[PDB]
Design an enzyme around this catalytic site. Sequence first.
Site, PDB file in Angstrom:
ATOM      1  N   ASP A  35      -7.231  -0.161  10.079  1.00  0.00           N
ATOM      2  CA  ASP A  35      -7.452   0.350   8.725  1.00  0.00           C
ATOM      3  C   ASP A  35      -6.890   1.763   8.607  1.00  0.00           C
ATOM      4  O   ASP A  35      -7.551   2.721   9.011  1.00  0.00           O
ATOM      5  CB  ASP A  35      -8.943   0.329   8.406  1.00  0.00           C
ATOM      6  CG  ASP A  35      -9.255   0.837   7.021  1.00  0.00           C
ATOM      7  OD1 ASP A  35      -8.307   0.959   6.219  1.00  0.00           O
ATOM      8  OD2 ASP A  35     -10.457   1.087   6.747  1.00  0.00           O
ATOM      9  N   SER A 199       5.025   7.649  -4.663  1.00  0.00           N
ATOM     10  CA  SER A 199       6.108   6.740  -4.993  1.00  0.00           C
ATOM     11  C   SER A 199       6.896   7.294  -6.177  1.00  0.00           C
ATOM     12  O   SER A 199       6.350   7.971  -7.045  1.00  0.00           O
ATOM     13  CB  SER A 199       5.527   5.357  -5.305  1.00  0.00           C
ATOM     14  OG  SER A 199       6.497   4.479  -5.842  1.00  0.00           O
TER      15      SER A 199
END
EC number: 3.4.23.22
Length: 330
Positions: A35, A199
């Site tokens: 994770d 992004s």
Amino acid sequence: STGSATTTPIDSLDDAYITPVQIGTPAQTLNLDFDTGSSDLWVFSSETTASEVDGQTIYTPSKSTTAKLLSGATWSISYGDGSSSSGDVYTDTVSVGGLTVTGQAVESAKKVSSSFTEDSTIDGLLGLAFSTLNTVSPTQQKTFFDNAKASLDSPVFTADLGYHAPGTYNFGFIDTTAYTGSITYTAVSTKQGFWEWTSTGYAVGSGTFKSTSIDGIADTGTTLLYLPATVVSAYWAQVSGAKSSSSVGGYVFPCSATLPSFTFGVGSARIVIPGDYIDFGPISTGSSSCFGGIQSSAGIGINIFGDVALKAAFVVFNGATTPTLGFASK
């Protein structure tokens, strides 16, 4: 040193991935959910409340000659999805794919919430976010990666998740045969303890690319791709009959649909998520309404590049002095 381990989807939907991890002496092999959105290595154990164990493999520290109680240490974690676990702490030897850390904090669960009990395939979590998020008190503990880093050939790990197929976590090296083209690196903020990056935009299907900054986390422990409501609406508007359902908890679409791809930007590079990766199947057994793999992050507080996005790429988690993230097509 290096390590290399195969990671395997837990079910036919890729709801999560499990990776075998050796703990203790002699080794006890547990299948953990790696994770990159959390920083605790915790396991089902001989100390876990019996009624909360249903098929998981347990770590028994009393059977490990290298286990030592970390005296006074406790831990307690709550994940964004509302699940939780807590317990006490041992140090022990932990190996992943041939890479060994001695003295790793292994957080032994005394309590786990119902979703953990109900998932027989996940024996615990191995956190790979920054150690500043680790929950052990009163002495915070380091992640497996943080402990291994100085010994690694290069201070990196990579995630290469498969679509409906196994993939690979590598530690300490970049497998140049595992991706196509070049790796594009992008800046990371560690201020919230996550692999947080920006992004450069998105496209839906064959549509034109929209240049827009989307700040989010690279999180292997989250199944889906969670993005701003504007972006998500633009995606699902291209699927006939798709709608946001408050009762189901997100966007659903007719199972008869053919889904468009979704592209996200990494600098000037582009990662294409095929439409099929966005199908999470019937909302309930036999339903013709299917659950979408791109969902709104409104109300989460952060955008999440979970498995739906990461599995479309070869992803480098660069833990150099100034961390960065790399993405390549594959």
